[PDB]
Design an enzyme around this catalytic site. Structure first.
Site, PDB file in Angstrom:
ATOM      1  N   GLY A 161      44.758 -10.402  -4.974  1.00  0.00           N
ATOM      2  CA  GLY A 161      44.627 -10.932  -3.627  1.00  0.00           C
ATOM      3  C   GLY A 161      43.303 -10.610  -2.940  1.00  0.00           C
ATOM      4  O   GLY A 161      42.994 -11.181  -1.900  1.00  0.00           O
ATOM      5  N   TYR A 168      50.541 -18.385  -0.715  1.00  0.00           N
ATOM      6  CA  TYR A 168      51.539 -18.090   0.295  1.00  0.00           C
ATOM      7  C   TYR A 168      52.337 -19.333   0.546  1.00  0.00           C
ATOM      8  O   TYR A 168      51.797 -20.317   1.041  1.00  0.00           O
ATOM      9  CB  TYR A 168      50.885 -17.613   1.600  1.00  0.00           C
ATOM     10  CG  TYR A 168      50.194 -16.271   1.500  1.00  0.00           C
ATOM     11  CD1 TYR A 168      48.911 -16.172   0.973  1.00  0.00           C
ATOM     12  CD2 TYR A 168      50.817 -15.108   1.949  1.00  0.00           C
ATOM     13  CE1 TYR A 168      48.272 -14.955   0.881  1.00  0.00           C
ATOM     14  CE2 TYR A 168      50.181 -13.879   1.860  1.00  0.00           C
ATOM     15  CZ  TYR A 168      48.908 -13.812   1.322  1.00  0.00           C
ATOM     16  OH  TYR A 168      48.253 -12.602   1.214  1.00  0.00           O
ATOM     17  N   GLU A 181      41.404  -7.178   7.322  1.00  0.00           N
ATOM     18  CA  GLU A 181      41.483  -7.194   5.856  1.00  0.00           C
ATOM     19  C   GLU A 181      41.258  -5.795   5.285  1.00  0.00           C
ATOM     20  O   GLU A 181      40.686  -4.932   5.966  1.00  0.00           O
ATOM     21  CB  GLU A 181      40.461  -8.181   5.275  1.00  0.00           C
ATOM     22  CG  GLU A 181      40.617  -9.589   5.839  1.00  0.00           C
ATOM     23  CD  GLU A 181      41.984 -10.186   5.556  1.00  0.00           C
ATOM     24  OE1 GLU A 181      42.381 -10.184   4.374  1.00  0.00           O
ATOM     25  OE2 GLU A 181      42.657 -10.668   6.505  1.00  0.00           O
ATOM     26  N   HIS A 267      43.847 -10.334  13.269  1.00  0.00           N
ATOM     27  CA  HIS A 267      44.513 -11.605  13.389  1.00  0.00           C
ATOM     28  C   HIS A 267      45.961 -11.425  13.032  1.00  0.00           C
ATOM     29  O   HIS A 267      46.342 -10.473  12.349  1.00  0.00           O
ATOM     30  CB  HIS A 267      43.873 -12.676  12.498  1.00  0.00           C
ATOM     31  CG  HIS A 267      43.654 -12.225  11.093  1.00  0.00           C
ATOM     32  ND1 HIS A 267      42.679 -11.313  10.755  1.00  0.00           N
ATOM     33  CD2 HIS A 267      44.295 -12.539   9.940  1.00  0.00           C
ATOM     34  CE1 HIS A 267      42.715 -11.101   9.449  1.00  0.00           C
ATOM     35  NE2 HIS A 267      43.679 -11.838   8.932  1.00  0.00           N
ATOM     36  N   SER A 279      44.394 -17.838  -0.512  1.00  0.00           N
ATOM     37  CA  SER A 279      43.413 -16.964   0.107  1.00  0.00           C
ATOM     38  C   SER A 279      42.926 -15.832  -0.791  1.00  0.00           C
ATOM     39  O   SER A 279      43.545 -15.486  -1.804  1.00  0.00           O
ATOM     40  CB  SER A 279      43.982 -16.364   1.408  1.00  0.00           C
ATOM     41  OG  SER A 279      45.290 -15.876   1.225  1.00  0.00           O
TER      42      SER A 279
END
Ligand SMILES: CC(=O)Nc1ccc(O)c(-c2cc(C(=O)O)ccn2)c1
Ligand SMILES: [Mn+2]
Ligand SMILES: [Zn+2]
Length: 345
Positions: A161, A168, A181, A267, A279
């Protein structure tokens, strides 16, 4: 300037060089919001059709149980039995789990925050894999060719990932909690197909305020970990952010659109209905200082840590000795674009 989420519409020629375009949107100030949308050229498509993936297996589907009140929530992710996309989709579109009726986003938004803790959904999250065809060379999430690849070029290290792609599969009311992140990297998110994904963002220059708020509300959590938001279990509504004066913005990502998050851009958000997103993380020269200063989870061993040493050696050789000795006191200015943006300035 108002640190608001910006949207960009590259030409196909502009779309060819991924790193260069990120340098461009940063020259426009896109990084200040901590989040930006990129709409790809009409000519571009990552895969001809999505009709041949009904047999794709979602190895570890999670049921998202949520507890809380007055805009503050904790989310417990419970692993369920493996599942095919076809099996997921039919659960997703079932009457029990499908999107409610609504007029404007604002109404769906109210319904999300109202029914957050009821009728826990399943999120087909963190599936290793790509839906890009092998021949697609523009914005290919499987091989973005940024300096993050150093983790696997110079070192032999693979992080699922993080420098490999994740899929997802969402349904209505599935959530991603407030987080930056791993290592405060960038991320890229492409919504392959389906209903929309809505995003909240806090500018990186006000991220600490978000953290102070969270620490306030979860003091026991704050005590047992240095970076408990990295557990990705904490949900905080826009009304709570507005109440305590945390600046933020919101945006809705539609099928066929990219979202970019920037270093130390908090976020959170939720899916409107059945959809699929791909992603991974990536980096630029600007990220390196964030990597060096990132505050990591201190209570788990199975969490992501990237040795910064090779990045400092290669890109900041004049600071390596000082850094290695613990005397690098560089202060991050969140408003500055990455060095590569010089070209457009
Ligand atoms: C389950 C987990 O590790 N959470 C996680 C870890 C890193 C991330 O970037 C995101 C994430 C997920 C989404 C999404 O679910 O669409 C959007 C933005 N960020 C979610
Ligand atoms: Mn994220
Ligand atoms: Zn922790």
């Amino acid at each position: 300037p108002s640190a608001r989420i910006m949207t960009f519409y590259p030409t196909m020629e502009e779309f060819r060089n991924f790193s260069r375009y990120i340098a461009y949107i940063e020259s426009q100030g896109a990084h200040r919001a901590g989040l930006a949308k990129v709409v790809p050229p009409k000519e571009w498509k990552p895969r001809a059709s999505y009709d041949d993936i009904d047999d794709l297996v979602i190895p570890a589907p999670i049921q998202q149980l949520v507890t809380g009140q007055s805009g503050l929530f904790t989310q417990y992710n419970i692993q369920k039995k493996a599942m095919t996309v076809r099996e997921f989709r039919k659960i997703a579109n079932s009457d029990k789990y499908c999107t409610p009726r609504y007029s404007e986003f604002e109404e769906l938004e109210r319904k999300y925050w109202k029914n957050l803790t009821f009728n826990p959904p399943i999120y087909g999250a963190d599936v290793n894999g790509t839906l890009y065809e092998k021949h697609v060379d523009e914005w290919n999430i499987g091989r973005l060719r940024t300096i993050l690849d150093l983790v696997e070029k110079e070192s032999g290290i693979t992080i699922e990932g993080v420098n490999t792609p994740y899929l997802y599969f969402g349904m209505w009311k599935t959530s991603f909690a407030w987080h930056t992140e791993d290592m405060d990297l960038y991320s890229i998110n492409y919504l392959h197909f389906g209903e929309p994904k809505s995003w909240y963002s806090v500018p990186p220059e006000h991220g600490k305020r978000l953290e102070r708020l969270a620490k306030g509300f979860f003091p026991g959590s704050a005590q047992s970990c240095e970076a408990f938001l990295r557990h990705k279990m904490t949900l905080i509504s826009p009304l709570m952010l507005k109440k305590y004066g945390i600046p933020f913005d919101k945006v809705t990502q539609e099928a066929g659109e990219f979202m970019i998050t920037f270093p130390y851009g908090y976020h959170a958000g939720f899916n409107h209905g059945f959809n699929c997103a791909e992603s991974t993380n990536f980096a630029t020269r600007r990220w390196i200082e964030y990597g060096k200063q990132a505050v990591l989870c201190s209570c788990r061993k199975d969490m992501v840590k990237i040795s910064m040493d090779v990045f400092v050696r290669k890109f900041q050789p004049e600071r390596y000795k000082l850094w290695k000795a613990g005397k690098d006191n560089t202060v991050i200015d969140h408003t500055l674009p990455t060095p590569e943006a010089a070209e457009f300035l």
